[PDB]
Design an enzyme around this catalytic site. Structure first.
Site: not given
Ligand SMILES: Nc1ncnc2c1ncn2[C@@H]1O[C@H](COP(=O)(O)OP(=O)(O)OP(=O)(O)O)[C@@H](O)[C@H]1O
Ligand SMILES: COc1ccc2c(c1)CN(Cc1ccc(C(=O)O)cc1)CCS2
Lengths: 204, 436, 273, 107, 97
Positions: D26, D36-37, D56, D82, D99
């Protein structure tokens, strides 16, 4: 180098001699143009007021920073009309005194609807006469200016120079005035007549 | 506030040397078509997804440099307002990805064929993937430049350009009215794949630094003949103007005799039959008058270009030798055409430059006349479609045809000198185009 | 600095105007900080109302064209961070534009977005065709209004609403920019003021000033000019691209296999790396 | 609040069920475009089991709709991620997460 | 110090005319006359060629007379054109002038 003004007076402090025309009689056979264009130049000043964004007024005043006596022809007194023609009278005298005959090829005839401009081009032979007339504007201007100045004997006006010597920026005053008269003669068809050198032959 | 860092892949763009555009009076066709077939794509060669986009870009403005740029770098097709790309799922323009709907949406994968259509008349850019239409079009974009096919990619791709003809057979039939991009190759250049505004390239002994590249403009395809509105020829030039058409026709007929043309009622190049291939007088007057309009301009352009020409010699016109075709090299009619013999005539080097300018103007006059009739340039000649390989400005014409027009104008000048008329080469006025 | 009756301003002056060797050419100016539209748009005396002023999303700034500077040589508006058009003969026809149109399986356009990098108005559209006196007594004060919650942009000539307007997509960054050809010693003046019930630009450029209606000109906000040429570092390695003619029917093949990666430094407010 | 937009098709037959480990690669970005990731940077696929609330809730439905080998784009509303609290120092409050997820295999 | 007096060209031009007019002055001793001439020569050596245009215009009217007063202007013109020949001949003109 090729000089744009490839012509000279071939004459001779500096004393600008004017052109003597009061002695000779002024032909009045073309008076249909002499009187008409004499008041037409001042008529163009009316169009200059609407471009100044300040209109014409009747009362004499120094606050309008324009001509204070400019009035519509319905209430325009001819006292000023009969004195503004003098510069035009000698202007026609000047251009006819230099052996330049003028012939009326054509036969005809509060806002100056026909606009007299100066941004258009013209032939070299006819424009040369206008520049020569513009020279006569300057020397006559220089003559009367130096008459007041000569009473001192010291110093001179910065523009008391020959017409060919002064640059174009100080020439546009007499240049445009002479051209504007020629432009009026252009669209009506006034033929005034008294060379053909290529650019290569004009090089230094 | 704080500066951001991330690892990005390098993206490079590859284009064919095919440039099309639209302009008033331009000789270029308006609708173009090409295909790109994907053979091998590695979806993730690195941590970042593989880049692959197909579309059109504008010559004046699309200059993707390697490394940094707009957004997070890796700028390709559609990362500015000078390019319009398509990656299988989105339409890219101005560095903004807009999702688009197609039957079976997926990112560009092997065995995918992307069809790009450019219609400069609207203007509009449309795409098709594997034959199905892509429900999204670019339109109402700028036209101040030339458009070229372009593909942007990262490492791990393998695509093939399909340009039609002998440069890649199309997998799908182009939409009606669109022309294959291979027809847009200029006569002076060969089709090839090149980078875009590269400042560096590999060399034998090491990397080569490359300066700016000269690029054409959409105005370069607009013929600009000199003005001939001032139609005032001297009476001696007016009478000899028609006689000039007689001589050039014989010279044109003579050159056809070298090509094998003979006399014939039908006028065909392949059949090599020409009614004029008998004699200038035996040539029909209406057929002679066909180039009389052109012949009138030829003398007029001499005045237009600034050349001083007059009837310097009249006795020279009265007495002059006449070259005749050899009896062995005869046409079907068998007569001997008699063009003016001008072997004794010599031209100054300045006069030779005048012939070049006359040839350039004559081609441009013919070019703009054909454009008004609807003709357009094409590598492959198509008479029913009004496509001509020579429908290009003289400067862009190949040297082989350029010399042919130059020789014809030389004989016309020789004919004037044969009559003894004075020809004054104008004092050439230099100018700086400032193309860039 | 902002006085009692005037807001803080950034005034541009021509140092060498009129003198010999003076440089007169098209000047492309913009402010150093952008205004960013909201992520999502909303569905469908002379004293500010406290409740209206604290809930409005409309921001204002104006440009004063001083007397002597020809309005016909002034363009006022906004530029996106991807404007790189250094045209010495600039006009509104040179502005990059493109329309992206989406539809269903059979035509039926359901979305037609318009994209550009320059949203400006011409100063020549706000001058009456008076006989002459085109150098007016009154300076031209072109105002610009942006609503970050709707993406709608409007302009005012001298307090009169103009007909021209623009619509932009969410998350768009716009820099206040003026394109001017100088014709006077005093050229332009960015006026970072406010209108009635409208927040100033400082309220939109800075997070800490979102609810501050007092106009501000912090030091970070400065006038930037478009420089045609800049130094750039050549990469140490370049992608190896192999181009060849695969055949008459296969066409021309492009191939690139060896990966190359660089570490990019991204400047957030300029949206460039 | 999960929207699944396909990028590359999978097999279209096998789907992850409850109690089965999912191996995915991902790359997560905020909906404005800021990454961010990403599991690609660490060069190690991410493994999780459906139904255990390891990830999540947006990933619970999003991956369940995908097939093995499929690469899809999941847009998760703040409620399905979140949300108001957010991830301190990584994800701002009330942030929509996007994502790019590829379902490598199931185990 | 007159090298960069472009901003005060009006005053500098007036100064040049006055000192030149002083040189063409009667009732001046020979010693006094050369001091005036030396000052005029020194000024024209450092003043930019563009600011000497008006002075040259006056010299055009006077030098062709070639009287006894024409000796100094002839030397002044000789030094001016020898020093500033690039300003008039080269198409690009003299450097930074
Ligand atoms: N009057 C003219 N007609 C046609 N071509 C001309 C003419 N004058 C010059 N040319 C030149 O001839 C070339 C094109 O000629 P074109 O293709 O028409 O020849 P063609 O096919 O032999 O003639 P045609 O079409 O009459 O059968 C160009 O280089 C053009 O500049
Ligand atoms: C420069 O001028 C040219 C240059 C090239 C050509 C022609 C005329 C001729 N045109 C048609 C034509 C052919 C023959 C005649 C004739 O013999 O009367 C008249 C017109 C096109 C064919 S190539």
């Amino acid at each position: 180098y090729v000089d744009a003004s490839y012509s000279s007076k071939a004459e001779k402090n500096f004393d600008p001699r004017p052109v003597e025309t009061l002695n000779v009689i002024i032909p009045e056979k073309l008076d249909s143009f002499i009187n008409k264009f004499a008041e037409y130049t001042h008529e163009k000043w009316a169009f200059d007021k609407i471009q100044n964004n300040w209109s014409y007024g009747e009362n004499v005043d120094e606050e309008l920073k324009t001509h204070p006596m400019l009035r519509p022809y319905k209430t325009f007194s001819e006292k000023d009309k009969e004195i503004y023609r003098w510069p035009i009278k000698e202007s026609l005298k000047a251009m006819i005194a230099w052996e330049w005959t003028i012939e009326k090829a054509r036969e005809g005839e509060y806002n100056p609807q026909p606009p007299d401009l100066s941004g258009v081009t013209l032939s070299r032979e006819l424009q040369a006469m206008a520049e020569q007339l513009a020279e006569n504007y300057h020397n006559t201007w220089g003559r009367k200016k130096k008459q007041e100045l000569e009473a001192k004997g010291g110093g001179t006006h910065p523009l008391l120079v020959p017409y060919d010597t002064l640059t174009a920026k100080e020439k546009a005053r007499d240049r445009e005035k002479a051209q504007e008269l020629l432009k009026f003669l252009q669209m009506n068809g006034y033929a005034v007549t008294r060379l053909d050198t290529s650019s290569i032959e004009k090089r230094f | 506030l704080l500066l951001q860092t991330n690892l990005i892949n390098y993206v490079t763009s590859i284009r064919p040397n095919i440039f099309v555009g639209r302009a008033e009076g331009s000789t270029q066709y308006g609708k173009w078509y090409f295909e790109v077939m994907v053979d091998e794509v590695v979806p993730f060669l690195t941590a970042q997804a593989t880049h692959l986009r197909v579309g059109w870009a504008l010559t004046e403005g699309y200059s993707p440099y390697p490394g940094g740029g707009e957004g997070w770098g890796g700028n390709g097709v559609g990362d500015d307002l000078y390019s319009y790309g398509f990656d299988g799922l989105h339409l890219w323009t101005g560095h903004v990805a807009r999702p688009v709907t197609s039957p079976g949406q997926h990112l560009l994968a092997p065995e995918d064929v992307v069809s790009c259509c450019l219609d400069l008349s609207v203007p509009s850019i449309s795409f098709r993937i594997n034959g199905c239409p892509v429900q999204g079009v670019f339109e109402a974009f700028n036209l101040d430049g030339l458009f070229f096919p372009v593909v942007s990619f990262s490492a791990g791709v393998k695509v093939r350009f399909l340009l039609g003809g002998r440069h890649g057979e199309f997998k799908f039939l182009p939409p009606p009215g669109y022309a294959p991009c291979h027809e847009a190759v200029l006569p002076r250049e060969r089709l090839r794949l090149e980078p875009i505004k590269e400042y560096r390239r590999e060399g034998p002994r090491g990397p080569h630094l490359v300066g700016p590249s000269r690029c054409l403009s959409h105005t370069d395809f607009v013929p600009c003949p000199v003005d001939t509105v001032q139609i005032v020829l001297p009476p001696h030039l007016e009478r000899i103007r028609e006689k000039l058409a007689e001589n050039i026709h014989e010279l044109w007929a003579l050159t056809r005799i070298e090509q094998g043309w003979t006399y014939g009622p039908v006028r065909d190049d392949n059949k090599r039959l020409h009614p004029c291939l008998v004699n200038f007088h035996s040539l029909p007057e209406p057929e002679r008058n066909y180039n009389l309009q052109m012949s009138g301009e030829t003398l007029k352009t001499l005045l237009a270009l600034g050349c001083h020409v007059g009837m310097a010699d009249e006795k020279a016109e009265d007495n002059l030798k006449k070259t005749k075709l050899p009896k062995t090299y005869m046409m079907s009619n068998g007569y001997k055409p008699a063009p003016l013999d001008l072997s004794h005539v010599r031209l100054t080097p300045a006069q030779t430059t005048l012939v070049d300018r006359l040839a350039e103007n004559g081609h441009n006059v013919w070019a703009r006349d054909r454009v008004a009739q609807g003709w357009s340039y094409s590598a492959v000649q198509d008479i029913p479609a009004r496509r001509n390989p020579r429908l290009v400005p003289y400067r862009l014409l190949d040297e082989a045809t350029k010399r042919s027009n130059r020789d014809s104008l030389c004989q016309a000048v020789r004919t004037l000198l044969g009559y003894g008329y004075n020809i004054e080469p104008p004092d050439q006025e230099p100018s700086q185009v400032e193309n860039q | 600095d902002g006085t009692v009756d005037t807001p803080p301003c950034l005034r541009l002056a021509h140092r060498t105007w009129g003198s010999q060797n003076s440089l007169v050419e098209m000047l492309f100016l913009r402010l150093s900080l952008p205004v960013q539209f909201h992520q999502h748009f909303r569905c469908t005396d002379n004293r500010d109302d406290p409740e209206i002023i604290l809930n409005t999303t409309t921001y204002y700034y104006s440009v004063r064209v001083f007397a002597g500077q020809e309005p016909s040589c002034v363009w006022v508006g906004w530029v996106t961070p991807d404007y790189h058009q250094h045209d010495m003969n600039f006009d509104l026809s040179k502005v990059r534009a493109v329309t992206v149109t989406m539809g269903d399986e059979q035509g039926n356009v359901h979305s037609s977005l318009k994209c550009s990098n320059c949203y400006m108005v011409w100063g020549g559209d706000f001058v009456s065709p008076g006989q002459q006196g085109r150098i007016s007594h009154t300076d031209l004060v072109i105002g610009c209004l942006v609503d970050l919650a709707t993406g709608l942009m409007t302009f005012t000539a001298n307090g009169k609403e103009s007909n021209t307007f623009f619509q932009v997509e969410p998350n768009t960054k716009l820099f206040p920019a003026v394109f001017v050809l100088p014709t006077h010693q005093n050229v332009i003046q960015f006026e970072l003021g406010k209108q009635k019930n409208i927040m100033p630009l400082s309220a939109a450029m800075f997070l800490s000033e979102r609810k501050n209606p007092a106009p501000q000109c912090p030091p970070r906000l400065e006038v930037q000019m478009l420089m045609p040429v800049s130094w750039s570092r050549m990469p140490n390695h370049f992608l190896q691209v192999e181009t060849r003619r695969a055949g008459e029917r296969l066409g021309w093949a492009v191939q690139c296999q060896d990966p190359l990666t660089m570490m990019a430094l991204h400047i957030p407010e300029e949206n460039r790396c | 609040g999960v929207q699944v937009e396909t990028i590359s098709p999978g097999d279209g037959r096998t789907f992850p069920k409850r109690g089965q480990t999912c191996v995915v690669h991902y790359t997560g970005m905020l909906e404005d475009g800021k990454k961010f990731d990403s599991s690609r940077d660490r060069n190690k696929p991410f493994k999780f089991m459906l139904g255990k609330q390891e990830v999540i809730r947006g990933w619970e439905e999003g991956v369940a709709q995908m097939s093995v080998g499929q690469r899809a784009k999941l847009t998760i509303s703040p409620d399905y991620a979140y949300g108001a609290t957010g991830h301190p120092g990584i994800i701002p409050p009330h942030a929509t997460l996007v994502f790019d997820v590829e379902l490598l295999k199931l185990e | 110090l007159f090298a960069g007096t472009e901003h005060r060209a009006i005053m500098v031009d007036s100064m040049l005319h006055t000192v030149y007019r002083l040189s063409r002055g009667r009732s001046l001793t020979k010693a006094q006359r050369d001091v005036i001439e030396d000052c005029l020569m020194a000024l024209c050596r450092y003043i930019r060629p563009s600011m000497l245009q008006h002075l040259l215009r006056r010299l055009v009217f006077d030098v062709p007379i070639l009287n006894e007063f024409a000796k100094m202007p002839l030397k002044l013109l000789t030094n001016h054109y020898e020093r500033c020949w690039k300003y008039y001949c080269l198409p690009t003109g003299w450097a930074n002038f």
